Amino acid sequence: PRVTVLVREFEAFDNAVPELVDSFLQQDPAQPVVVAADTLPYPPLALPRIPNVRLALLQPALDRPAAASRPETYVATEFVALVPDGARAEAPGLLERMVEALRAGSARLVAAPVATANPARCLALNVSLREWTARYGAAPAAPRCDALDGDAVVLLRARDLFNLSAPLARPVGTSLFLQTALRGWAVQLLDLTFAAARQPPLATAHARWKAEREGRARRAALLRALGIRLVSWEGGRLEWFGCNKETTRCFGTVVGDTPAYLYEERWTPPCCLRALRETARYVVGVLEAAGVRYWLEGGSLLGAARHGDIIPWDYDVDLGIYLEDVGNCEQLRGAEAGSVVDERGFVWEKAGDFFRVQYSESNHLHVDLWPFYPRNGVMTKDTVEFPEHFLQPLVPLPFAGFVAQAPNNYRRFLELKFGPGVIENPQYPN
Amino acid sequence: PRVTVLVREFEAFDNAVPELVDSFLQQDPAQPVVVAADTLPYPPLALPRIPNVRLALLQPALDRPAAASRPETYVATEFVALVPDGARAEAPGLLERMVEALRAGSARLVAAPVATANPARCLALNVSLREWTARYGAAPAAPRCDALDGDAVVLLRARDLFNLSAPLARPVGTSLFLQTALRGWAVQLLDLTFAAARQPPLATAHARWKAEREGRARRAALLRALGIRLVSWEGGRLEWFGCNKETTRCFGTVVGDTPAYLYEERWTPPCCLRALRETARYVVGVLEAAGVRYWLEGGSLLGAARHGDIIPWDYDVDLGIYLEDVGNCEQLRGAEAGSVVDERGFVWEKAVEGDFFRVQYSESNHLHVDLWPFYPRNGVMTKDTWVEFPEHFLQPLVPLPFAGFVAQAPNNYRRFLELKFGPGVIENPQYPNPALLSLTG
Amino acid sequence: GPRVTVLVREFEAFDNAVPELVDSFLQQDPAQPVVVAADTLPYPPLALPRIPNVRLALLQPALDRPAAASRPETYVATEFVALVPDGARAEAPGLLERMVEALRAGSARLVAAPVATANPARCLALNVSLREWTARYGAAPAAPRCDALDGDAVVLLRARDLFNLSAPLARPVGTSLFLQTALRGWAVQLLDLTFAAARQPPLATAHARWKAEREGRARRAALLRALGIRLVSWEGGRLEWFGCNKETTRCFGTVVGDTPAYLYEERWTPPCCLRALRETARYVVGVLEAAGVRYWLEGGSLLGAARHGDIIPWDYDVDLGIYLEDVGNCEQLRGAEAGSVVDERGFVWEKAVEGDFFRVQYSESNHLHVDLWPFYPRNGVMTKDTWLDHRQDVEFPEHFLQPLVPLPFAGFVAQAPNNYRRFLELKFGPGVIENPQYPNPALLS
Amino acid sequence: GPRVTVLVREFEAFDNAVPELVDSFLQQDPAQPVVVAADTLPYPPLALPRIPNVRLALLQPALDRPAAASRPETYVATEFVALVPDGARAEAPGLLERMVEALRAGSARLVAAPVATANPARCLALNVSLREWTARYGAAPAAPRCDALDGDAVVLLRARDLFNLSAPLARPVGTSLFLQTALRGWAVQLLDLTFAAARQPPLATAHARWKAEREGRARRAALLRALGIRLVSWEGGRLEWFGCNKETTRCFGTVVGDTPAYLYEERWTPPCCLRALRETARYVVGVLEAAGVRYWLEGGSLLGAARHGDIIPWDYDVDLGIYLEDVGNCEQLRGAEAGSVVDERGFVWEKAVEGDFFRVQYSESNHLHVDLWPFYPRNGVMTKDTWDVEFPEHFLQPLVPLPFAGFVAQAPNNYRRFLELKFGPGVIENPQYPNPALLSLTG
Numbered sequence A: 001p002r003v004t005v006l007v008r009e010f011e012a013f014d015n016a017v018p019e020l021v022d023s024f025l026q027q028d029p030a031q032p033v034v035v036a037a038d039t040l041p042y043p044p045l046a047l048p049r050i051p052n053v054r055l056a057l058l059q060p061a062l063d064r065p066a067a068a069s070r071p072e073t074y075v076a077t078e079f080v081a082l083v084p085d086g087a088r089a090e091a092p093g094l095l096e097r098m099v100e101a102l103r104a105g106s107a108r109l110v111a112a113p114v115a116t117a118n119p120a121r122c123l124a125l126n127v128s129l130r131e132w133t134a135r136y137g138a139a140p141a142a143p144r145c146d147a148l149d150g151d152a153v154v155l156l157r158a159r160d161l162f163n164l165s166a167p168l169a170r171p172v173g174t175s176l177f178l179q180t181a182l183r184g185w186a187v188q189l190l191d192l193t194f195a196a197a198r199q200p201p202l203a204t205a206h207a208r209w210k211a212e213r214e215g216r217a218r219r220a221a222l223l224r225a226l227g228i229r230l231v232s233w234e235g236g237r238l239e240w241f242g243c244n245k246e247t248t249r250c251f252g253t254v255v256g257d258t259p260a261y262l263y264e265e266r267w268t269p270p271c272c273l274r275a276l277r278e279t280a281r282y283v284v285g286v287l288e289a290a291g292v293r294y295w296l297e298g299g300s301l302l303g304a305a306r307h308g309d310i311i312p313w314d315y316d317v318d319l320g321i322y323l324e325d326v327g328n329c330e331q332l333r334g335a336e337a338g339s340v341v342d343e344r345g346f347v348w349e350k351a352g353d354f355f356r357v358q359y360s361e362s363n364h365l366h367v368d369l370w371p372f373y374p375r376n377g378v379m380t381k382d383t384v385e386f387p388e389h390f391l392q393p394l395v396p397l398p399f400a401g402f403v404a405q406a407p408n409n410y411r412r413f414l415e416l417k418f419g420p421g422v423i424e425n426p427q428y429p430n
Numbered sequence B: 001p002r003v004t005v006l007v008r009e010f011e012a013f014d015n016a017v018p019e020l021v022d023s024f025l026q027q028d029p030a031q032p033v034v035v036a037a038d039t040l041p042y043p044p045l046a047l048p049r050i051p052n053v054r055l056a057l058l059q060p061a062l063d064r065p066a067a068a069s070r071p072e073t074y075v076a077t078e079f080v081a082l083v084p085d086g087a088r089a090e091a092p093g094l095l096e097r098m099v100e101a102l103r104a105g106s107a108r109l110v111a112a113p114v115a116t117a118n119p120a121r122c123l124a125l126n127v128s129l130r131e132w133t134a135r136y137g138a139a140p141a142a143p144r145c146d147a148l149d150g151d152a153v154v155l156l157r158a159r160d161l162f163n164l165s166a167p168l169a170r171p172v173g174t175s176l177f178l179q180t181a182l183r184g185w186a187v188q189l190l191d192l193t194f195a196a197a198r199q200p201p202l203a204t205a206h207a208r209w210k211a212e213r214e215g216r217a218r219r220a221a222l223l224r225a226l227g228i229r230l231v232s233w234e235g236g237r238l239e240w241f242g243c244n245k246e247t248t249r250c251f252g253t254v255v256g257d258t259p260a261y262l263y264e265e266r267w268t269p270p271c272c273l274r275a276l277r278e279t280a281r282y283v284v285g286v287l288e289a290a291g292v293r294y295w296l297e298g299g300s301l302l303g304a305a306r307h308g309d310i311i312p313w314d315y316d317v318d319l320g321i322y323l324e325d326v327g328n329c330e331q332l333r334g335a336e337a338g339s340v341v342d343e344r345g346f347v348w349e350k351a352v353e354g355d356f357f358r359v360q361y362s363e364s365n366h367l368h369v370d371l372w373p374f375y376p377r378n379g380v381m382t383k384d385t386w387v388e389f390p391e392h393f394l395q396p397l398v399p400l401p402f403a404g405f406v407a408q409a410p411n412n413y414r415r416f417l418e419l420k421f422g423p424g425v426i427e428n429p430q431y432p433n434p435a436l437l438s439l440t441g
Numbered sequence C: 001g002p003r004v005t006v007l008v009r010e011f012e013a014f015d016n017a018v019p020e021l022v023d024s025f026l027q028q029d030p031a032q033p034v035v036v037a038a039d040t041l042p043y044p045p046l047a048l049p050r051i052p053n054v055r056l057a058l059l060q061p062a063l064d065r066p067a068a069a070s071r072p073e074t075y076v077a078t079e080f081v082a083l084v085p086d087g088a089r090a091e092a093p094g095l096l097e098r099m100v101e102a103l104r105a106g107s108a109r110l111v112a113a114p115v116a117t118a119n120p121a122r123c124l125a126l127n128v129s130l131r132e133w134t135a136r137y138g139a140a141p142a143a144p145r146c147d148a149l150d151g152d153a154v155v156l157l158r159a160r161d162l163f164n165l166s167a168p169l170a171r172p173v174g175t176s177l178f179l180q181t182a183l184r185g186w187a188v189q190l191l192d193l194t195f196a197a198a199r200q201p202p203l204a205t206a207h208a209r210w211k212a213e214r215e216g217r218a219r220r221a222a223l224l225r226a227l228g229i230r231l232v233s234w235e236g237g238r239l240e241w242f243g244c245n246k247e248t249t250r251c252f253g254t255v256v257g258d259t260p261a262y263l264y265e266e267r268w269t270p271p272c273c274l275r276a277l278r279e280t281a282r283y284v285v286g287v288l289e290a291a292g293v294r295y296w297l298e299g300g301s302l303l304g305a306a307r308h309g310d311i312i313p314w315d316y317d318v319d320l321g322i323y324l325e326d327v328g329n330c331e332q333l334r335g336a337e338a339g340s341v342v343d344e345r346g347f348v349w350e351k352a353v354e355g356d357f358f359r360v361q362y363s364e365s366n367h368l369h370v371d372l373w374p375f376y377p378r379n380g381v382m383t384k385d386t387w388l389d390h391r392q393d394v395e396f397p398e399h400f401l402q403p404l405v406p407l408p409f410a411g412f413v414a415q416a417p418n419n420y421r422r423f424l425e426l427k428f429g430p431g432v433i434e435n436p437q438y439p440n441p442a443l444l445s
Numbered sequence D: 001g002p003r004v005t006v007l008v009r010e011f012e013a014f015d016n017a018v019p020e021l022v023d024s025f026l027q028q029d030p031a032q033p034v035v036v037a038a039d040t041l042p043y044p045p046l047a048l049p050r051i052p053n054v055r056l057a058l059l060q061p062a063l064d065r066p067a068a069a070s071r072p073e074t075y076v077a078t079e080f081v082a083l084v085p086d087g088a089r090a091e092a093p094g095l096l097e098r099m100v101e102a103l104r105a106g107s108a109r110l111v112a113a114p115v116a117t118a119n120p121a122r123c124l125a126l127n128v129s130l131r132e133w134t135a136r137y138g139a140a141p142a143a144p145r146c147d148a149l150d151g152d153a154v155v156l157l158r159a160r161d162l163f164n165l166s167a168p169l170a171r172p173v174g175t176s177l178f179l180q181t182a183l184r185g186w187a188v189q190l191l192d193l194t195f196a197a198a199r200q201p202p203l204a205t206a207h208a209r210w211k212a213e214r215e216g217r218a219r220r221a222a223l224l225r226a227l228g229i230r231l232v233s234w235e236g237g238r239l240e241w242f243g244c245n246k247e248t249t250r251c252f253g254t255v256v257g258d259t260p261a262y263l264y265e266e267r268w269t270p271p272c273c274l275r276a277l278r279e280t281a282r283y284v285v286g287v288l289e290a291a292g293v294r295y296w297l298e299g300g301s302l303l304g305a306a307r308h309g310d311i312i313p314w315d316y317d318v319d320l321g322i323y324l325e326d327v328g329n330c331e332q333l334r335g336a337e338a339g340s341v342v343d344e345r346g347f348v349w350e351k352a353v354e355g356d357f358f359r360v361q362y363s364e365s366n367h368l369h370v371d372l373w374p375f376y377p378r379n380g381v382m383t384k385d386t387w388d389v390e391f392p393e394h395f396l397q398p399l400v401p402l403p404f405a406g407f408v409a410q411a412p413n414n415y416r417r418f419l420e421l422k423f424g425p426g427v428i429e430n431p432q433y434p435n436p437a438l439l440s441l442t443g
């Protein structure tokens, strides 16, 4: 029952890694221990310079072979125990007990909380790469759970850990369970408890603030690298890691009306959909304030009728307007002369049948406004047409978080523009 | 089929990779081709959907195994030919011709220029990790080279390429030869030319500007990641990638009188030495203009007498001054009352601890020159906080080159240094010892 | 499931196939843990792959290394370890796994697979007797279950078992390992699995093999001497000696307190010392008989003869009584009164300094000796003028020498007093024949 | 409970006072832990008290013992160990307790108390240089704080410190312990405490001392060779050598791949090898000057002369250039063209296998060598028709004196230039000592 202790989560400026290692060596002087780091930690860890204690540096180096940064190269045992900074080994044979529980149980990961101020708690975790979203909540089948929040020693087989794509990506507490829950693996939170370091790290408030700031930065870089734009929680809390008003939109310029995310087998990033909803809400409010007649058109109306929201793989919003009302709103009249950035940061342009309103100068998620005019009972443009009675009157229809205006009998409207059964038969990307 | 074509250097928004792949498949439909990218290139490359053509996405992903991001997974031949975008296979049998050249010669790499506007040139290259420097120059033994500049097809054994730490780090033209030259590997530039693409990529000024801005940023991030702080060409045209007046110094706060770079088995970063030289030159200029008697002290005098410069693993500069001259310098007068940032950004501070003066390069970069005031008492210069020495060593002072300018030293500075440090200290440098530092701490 | 560390100990720095050995295992598993152990840093350089799963363990002391750096167990983190000799290669995949599976399913603590060299391993029996400084090898009665192996094999066992041995990696391992495992009652199961030989084997020339076998023979002799194995025997009767001879010093040096140093080490007289004592006793008896000197077995030599016709197994000399008036009959004896004498066969004869007796040493360098004690009859009682402070040195009736009787001793027939049971009990006490004890029980019994 | 274990390692089996030593400590505290350590069972018997707190530790492999039995840590259950030499005696009670209090309150990893023998312990300075294979001793400038002790002392330190060393009990302990502790930067504090001498001291006769010193000198010589200490010096002088010489082979033997064995050991050239190189260079230069052969420092020899007036400390040979027209002046050189020549002082002169140069070896057995490279002017440029880059002739018109290896040698004029033509700009100012990590990557 040989188990390698692997230490990955610690701060170079303030840690208790020397105590952690010394505590395990007191139980077994030949205990295999691997401390992993991206760069050489300074101030020096001053680990014992003995063969069974090794420092694994995970970044590329001009003077090292490929194997030097591959962590499975440092681990020869069957099992590996991820130990966070702040833990120490007090009683003996706790790793042995964790191995017995693993072999006895049915979960590929077992875990023992560390008696810190934040001991690990069970969590449910639901990962959707298609929607760039990870959803956390309370674990129904605790102590069997999908993920952990807080400090714990996690033990699993080395073949399972090191076949993951990013086994030691920081923060491990986020990166590991995103990967294991995606594979359908479970973590069993055992009744065992590891003691806290007798001289804990981050004792001052300034040190904790510094470490929390670095940790938030690593977590944001981790999720952006792995394609999680949104972390949502049971209870409603949202964590965003995508585009915003001051950034580019996530996918950039589209070619052949097929954005980049479709080729990646994903749908629209949720940050982009959120920006489209807020631009739709804003533009609708401006048009209504100015007394401009608008209705939902195209895929926006289709999504409204289907689920009251933007079709989750679409990337813009379409609205029809009465051409004779264009002069009622200041932004459209200005858009005739040139680009208009109003006081809320939205960009109105004509560019030349329709109008386009972009979320901001940097974020080019947009709503298109298509003017129509009644020639003799039929609404028509100049660069397909439909009868005007579909607009007399307009009906309230929920869309993107607010009540929009839609053509009356819009299911019939949508089936003239798209064909029979379009609401019930979404054209899923493949 | 013994060679796998590997394409790493291209841009997603403007490339000729489809023509490249097609040109090799026209010569052999079974030719193994691998296009490597960090993320899925957009717009779609639309490569042929055949077994011998594979798109390798090297970034880790939540739904992929570890092997998916390791490039050797995608190659099953003995050799790899790194082909840059803009090349095209025209004459058949060029890859087999490069293989026979490789086996018959003594170079680990062989290369063939691509007939673009920037065809590959033979270069010399020495990599010094201790000095954080990559020194380029004209190749003395061309067409045997240490590195190439320009477009070339580079062929080498897959075993050699994928044994490197960063085999496909971008730009390849930079990272590959930094790694192979450090290992003492040569590349032989053959008398073989690959044709250019018939529709070349980046054919407009705007497209090239986008590509060069992105390639410049990738090169800067690569050299910082790999610890190359200075790149030179024939000892000149310096390119810096380290600290400066507006940043922190490279190694930050020193613990246990041992800076971080010693634990990394290197010497002082050259950007840090450059800033130390500039600060010593500036402080000396100020002290001389104000009429302050100074002399090189400690390891600065030792370095000056040894080779006329800072000891390349030291991280500060020491000067002795006459205490009765302190009042002549505005900055030193101001330093007694508090921290002073002078008109050129240097920070002058009075050490309340050891009673010396410290001049820092800038408010953010704490590379410093220390000033040690001495006063005579019965012919011996002495201090009040802590070795004292006879004053006759200062009567008179002598000129001594140091750090690119002529500094002042005690007369008989060899005897002076020997009394301070011991006999033979000038001829026996205390070279850094990683093995010993690993044992002592 | 099973993690196994390959450990390489048996190779020569001047000529080896260790690079091919390690690379062959790395081709089956790139992360395969491999430990090469050496006493000093091999030059020319081994040039192993400088990857973290391949490590070199130097078993020398060094001023800049902790104690753990030379203890090989700190390099092995796996449950199992496989000793692999130079000249072997990993060809078939998963052989270490099959060896682990056979270990767990069997009852032996060691399992082994031969290597397809010109000398593949063979099953051997072995009992070790430290007290008699002897290791006895024979044919395996219950093959494929053995006490030892002869030849090249991969040997797999638990790290906890290997590194709790006193000298796990002492060279040659093929000798050292099984001396330690057989003494502990452990068995090695010889499996029907075969490792391939290296494609470019080491020691390809006759001259390279010649300097390798001489270096190995030097290491084996040093090993057995360090571990106290004086004699190795094989079925068929072949003997290898590693102790005394005519041309060296005796094994144990000067004796204080009647108790030689090996008895405190809980061992008996080394078998080489006993052999020399028998040869010297046989020779001296022939000289005295040819010279017409009446002699009889005395002291511990007579007691050992009466018990089992041989030297007492912990005794260290041989004692004979002779008639004083016969001394002039022997040329060596007459010369000994004038000084030290080295005779026709290299034996050294001297008149001692202590107490009026003669001593015959095996050689000038080897001081195993026969002591000749001259007696003369006063009036029916044998006596002498100077006495040693032993309870065994007394007068005795001359009728015990009239006549002398034959008695086997040390491989030949010797002359003994008649009624030697009563003779021995008079000088040693009742029941001495039936109650063996060490020379002086007050210090060691 | 006791906190110190007395450990005895330095004694002779044939003549010791270890029984008196043990008894004296047991008289102060009958439970006092005592360990006597030895490579083999001491004979004659020590006859130590048969009590659980007195144990004989045998540091030898044995067929019938576990690995723990030969590890001294196994025998010590206390925090501290007191290494006590033979000839010491415990009289004043509680001396071990004072040493513990002294160690805890001070800043030295070791503390020590002299034994009142004829050779009390003295405070010494000690610099250990593994790269130079040298142990340099001297007077201790900051006594009572020392790097090493010479003489008899009880030395106390933590068990975990002592047994963490590679060779904690290697003999002589007086040498091996401080070589290990001084290299680590540990200090020993010589306390103002004195242990008494044994009432019946060991080795009381001149003959017994002579045998003990002979065995101890043999142990020291084997210890220093095993640990890679080739040179011991006192105050820079009184040299004591433990390496190669005129009668032996050179330390590193045959060089493969132009990378001598000491580089892989992460050390520089052994000082015995450097000493023989300086002697051979001085001899050869003396021969060539007396015979009228014009020579000059070449290659790395000239570089070492210009940098610090000596051989570069990681080089292993010496290179000189000569005028080919002058080779007939020297008898040794003229005989070297016919074959190998062993001159009157044991030096071996040979003409190169291939390469057309001369080689002078220190002796028939020691192959440390000086190479002579003959050039000849071809219209103002020096050239050898065999290939040492060709250079113009005016650098030898004239030659200049340059200190090298303890004597004055000839160098090309403007040798700073000369070196930069052959090695590159700034070569004198930029020495790069061996990089073992780069060697581990390069091969």
Ligand SMILES: *[C@@H]1O[C@H](CO)[C@@H](O)[C@H](O)[C@H]1NC(C)=O
Residues within 6 Å of the ligand: A047, A048, A049, A050, B439, C064, C065, C066, D160, D161, D164
């Ligand atoms: C043992 O010595 C090594 C130095 O070689 C050091 O790293 C380690 O911490 C030491 N251990 C103890 C317990 O002193």
Ligand SMILES: *[C@@H]1O[C@H](CO)[C@@H](O)[C@H](O)[C@H]1NC(C)=O
Residues within 6 Å of the ligand: A124, A125, A126, A135, A136, A137, A138, A234
């Ligand atoms: C994950 O999916 C299940 C259905 O498979 C759903 O019931 C559950 O609520 C999801 N988890 C979270 C945290 O939303």
Ligand SMILES: *[C@@H]1O[C@H](CO)[C@@H](O)[C@H](O)[C@H]1NC(C)=O
Residues within 6 Å of the ligand: A072, A158, A159, A160, A162, A163, B066
């Ligand atoms: C992945 O799993 C396989 C099978 O369990 C194993 O052979 C391989 O070593 C693993 N990869 C690692 C540990 O990197």
Ligand SMILES: *[C@@H]1O[C@H](CO)[C@@H](O)[C@H](O)[C@H]1NC(C)=O
Residues within 6 Å of the ligand: A063, A064, A065, B159, B160, B163, C048, C049, C050, C051, D440, D441, D442
């Ligand atoms: C990879 O490079 C290392 C040098 O760090 C070398 O030791 C090793 O042999 C190389 N492996 C291969 C397969 O070339």
Ligand SMILES: *[C@@H]1O[C@H](CO)[C@@H](O)[C@H](O)[C@H]1NC(C)=O
Residues within 6 Å of the ligand: C073, C159, C160, C161, C162, C163, C164, D067
């Ligand atoms: C000796 O065996 C024990 C178990 O019996 C084990 O815990 C220990 O690690 C072993 N020692 C060595 C040096 O392998």
Ligand SMILES: *[C@@H]1O[C@H](CO)[C@@H](O)[C@H](O)[C@H]1NC(C)=O
Residues within 6 Å of the ligand: B421, B422, D125, D126, D127, D136, D137, D138, D139, D235, D236
């Ligand atoms: C030891 O080294 C120091 C500093 O290098 C030096 O001052 C001292 O003289 C040296 N002592 C000896 C005995 O060599």
Ligand SMILES: [Mg+2]
Residues within 6 Å of the ligand: A015, A199, A200, A201
């Ligand atoms: Mg702390």
Ligand SMILES: [Mg+2]
Residues within 6 Å of the ligand: A316, A368
């Ligand atoms: Mg659109």
Ligand SMILES: [Mg+2]
Residues within 6 Å of the ligand: B316, B370
């Ligand atoms: Mg300083």
Ligand SMILES: [Mg+2]
Residues within 6 Å of the ligand: C299, C300, C301, C315, C317, C318, C319
């Ligand atoms: Mg007898």
Ligand SMILES: [Mg+2]
Residues within 6 Å of the ligand: C317, C371
């Ligand atoms: Mg006797």
Ligand SMILES: [Mg+2]
Residues within 6 Å of the ligand: D317, D371
């Ligand atoms: Mg040479």
Ligand SMILES: [Zn+2]
Residues within 6 Å of the ligand: A242, A243, A244, A249, A250, A251, A269, A270, A271, A272, A273
């Ligand atoms: Zn977005």
Ligand SMILES: [Zn+2]
Residues within 6 Å of the ligand: B242, B243, B244, B249, B250, B251, B269, B270, B271, B272, B273
């Ligand atoms: Zn810098």
Ligand SMILES: [Zn+2]
Residues within 6 Å of the ligand: C243, C244, C250, C251, C270, C271, C272, C273, C274
């Ligand atoms: Zn013997």
Ligand SMILES: [Zn+2]
Residues within 6 Å of the ligand: D243, D244, D245, D250, D251, D252, D270, D271, D272, D273, D274
């Ligand atoms: Zn030498």
